[PDB]
Design a protein around this ligand. Sequence first.
Ligand SMILES: Cc1cc(NCc2ccc(CN3C[C@H](O)[C@@H](O)[C@H](O)[C@H]3CO)cc2)cc(-c2cccnn2)c1
Ligand SMILES: Cc1cc(NCc2ccc(CN3C[C@H](O)[C@@H](O)[C@H](O)[C@H]3CO)cc2)cc(-c2cccnn2)c1
Length: 765
Amino acid sequence: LHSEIGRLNNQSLLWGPYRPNIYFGTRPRIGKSLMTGLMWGKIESYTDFQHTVRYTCEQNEGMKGYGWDEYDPRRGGIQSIHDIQNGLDITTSFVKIPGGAHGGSWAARIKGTLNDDAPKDQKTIVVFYVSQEGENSELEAVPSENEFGYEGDVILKGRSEALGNYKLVVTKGKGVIPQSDHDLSRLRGPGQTVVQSLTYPDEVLWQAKPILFQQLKAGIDWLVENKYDVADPPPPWQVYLLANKPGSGNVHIVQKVFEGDFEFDILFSSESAGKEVTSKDLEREVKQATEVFGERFARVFDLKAPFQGDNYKKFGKSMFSNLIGGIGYFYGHSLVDRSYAPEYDEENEGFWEDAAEARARHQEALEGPYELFTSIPSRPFFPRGFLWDEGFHLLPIADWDIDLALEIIKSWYNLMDEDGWIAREQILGAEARSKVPKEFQTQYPHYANPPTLFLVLDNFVERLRKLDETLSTASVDNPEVGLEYLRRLYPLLRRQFDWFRKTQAGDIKSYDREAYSTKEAYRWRGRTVSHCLTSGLDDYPRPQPPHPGELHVDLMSWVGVMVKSLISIGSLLGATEDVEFYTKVLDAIEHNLDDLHWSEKEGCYCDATIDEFEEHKLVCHKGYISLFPFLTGLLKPDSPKLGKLLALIGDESELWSPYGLRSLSKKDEFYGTAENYWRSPVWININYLAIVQLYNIATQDGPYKETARDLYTRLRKNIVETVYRNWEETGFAWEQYNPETGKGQRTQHFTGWTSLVVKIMSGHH
Ligand SMILES: Cc1cc(NCc2ccc(CN3C[C@H](O)[C@@H](O)[C@H](O)[C@H]3CO)cc2)cc(-c2cccnn2)c1
Ligand SMILES: Cc1cc(NCc2ccc(CN3C[C@H](O)[C@@H](O)[C@H](O)[C@H]3CO)cc2)cc(-c2cccnn2)c1
């Protein structure tokens, strides 16, 4: 029954618009297979189309906004694109139709509506780009009846081992097709749909814009050779219309020119299924997906007071659909330094300089290939897997579809090497690499990231202990299934645990350091003078200078999260020897969090260094770091330490802004200094942990119950309303929010852990 749920999930999720780095495209969860992408741009001149054409996601003055209005990766969804430069409102509707042995069928409708500011006679070029990778696979455009291109539909017939036989149809569509009266129309036709069928080496098929432009430039070179010149030029849209040459190859370019509004369908028909997919099929499945998406949202994300209203419901659907809509499939090599240079052990003073010397040897090499199925922080800016981000992204996804979330956890944990290391940043394949400078690509096997994926496992464990509809919840509704999932992953969880304790260990025994445990102390590897990137709080102030004697209260707290998960999953698997080891490790962390990290003088937790005089010194910087034992659920509800953190959290002069908790206190010497990334702004991910723990205390007999209930109520309201106001004003989820103005700032389309707001609104933790 585990391998049967497996096959039905594999097949449910195979197809999707799993190219979030582009406005619209499709690929299956297979490295070397069939991919599609959409391009469009207005053409007003002989030189503008190269600047107007759209393919990879960006965010600038020329784009008002874009995102999924609805999405469920089992069924499909609807994307809205609002393009100022090209004067177009586009809708891309994608739908999956189960059937056959090959992951089923799909269809997509592309609809462009010129906005009021667009010239009514605007010429828009639309390209549907189709590529297929693999040694023993075939794809052929069926030639038209007409000389110069297609009056009707374009049919591609293809085959591969992975997909079997399939047809991909690009329909004629609705919309005026411009007609040239020029001489050139005798050789190129007056204007029609055209297809170029080409071949390139498999590994460059993803370079769709260069490949298209090489064919367009070749068309213009032919105009010059053949005496079409400035005395009497063809209209621009005809100069940029490829010569029809359908055939067989691994790249097929389908080009249309429309005057005014346009629409066309893409119909992918898996031959192993019954009858082929039609446009009437597309419209019915799109209608049904919407109904289902609507019914599930109302049950899964029942927004409670004061966000019961319809305005908060549209907001919630946008933040949720953009988060789950960001899901990509990535395949390729990553760039890893496998030297394990001894400079990486960082056991000297001034270690950052040594590690820089080791990096400057550039022993990093490509390895893999790897695959990853994951949601992402931002389509235009960070369209790839970030390890601790994915913990946050999967909390609302798991509500929607626990089986989906477990697939993504499996996918991430299938990347873990023999030592227990998953790279914090998954840049898979030359396409993923195109977006990232060489210097920033290299992953380092000593660099950790918070194990936030354990929090998703914690939520799945609570659910377990207490056919698209069915598949979504098969891993909870069938307890034998849930347990086998945990049985297979458990070894990898323990491996990661051991790897933290071997590679991210702090030094007690070597200094004047008294503490209940000689063992429990942690220090993030990878820290520079001004940064600690591996903690995830890039520029949060840490001991100066950095020092092999540093201890990091956030890292110890994360190891705490890990043991508590290992306890529950070990218990469930009767792993008695382990459950007794973890229990003794948890007890030592509880004691050592107090002994190495509690400041009675300051009333909070603090990181620690070693002095110019070789003794333990607390370095206190009041902010997120200071709260970490509380954020991570480690403190008993009667703890006086908790009571002092509740005071700091509520204190307007320190962390409490009208807009949420400040990353750093207004009192800290480093508030609003340097790049000011985690040195004052409000971050939704850390506020969400705060909101969850205030609720935990608020729904329990104890001395702080009422203080917690008040802070929970107000913080939930502040965070939700701040993100809601910015969404209403700008259309965007943002990375971070300004505690002075409430403005969203830095990275837009940040869905992204900012989408946690859906879960905050729905409460009932
Ligand atoms: C082309 C290029 C690449 C890179 N890569 C580095 C990078 C990657 C991702 C983030 C976002 N984010 C930061 C959070 O603190 C992390 O906790 C979080 O996990 C990650 C992921 O959501 C921040 C920096 C940065 C810039 C850039 C632009 C402007 C200024 N400085 N840098 C440009
Ligand atoms: C004031 C402000 C704005 C924003 N906007 C988000 C952002 C993200 C990354 C880029 C870079 N960009 C990314 C593209 O993926 C590339 O294709 C492109 O080549 C490069 C160009 O070098 C540009 C904007 C981010 C920060 C910030 C602050 C601290 C840390 N991280 N980010 C601050």
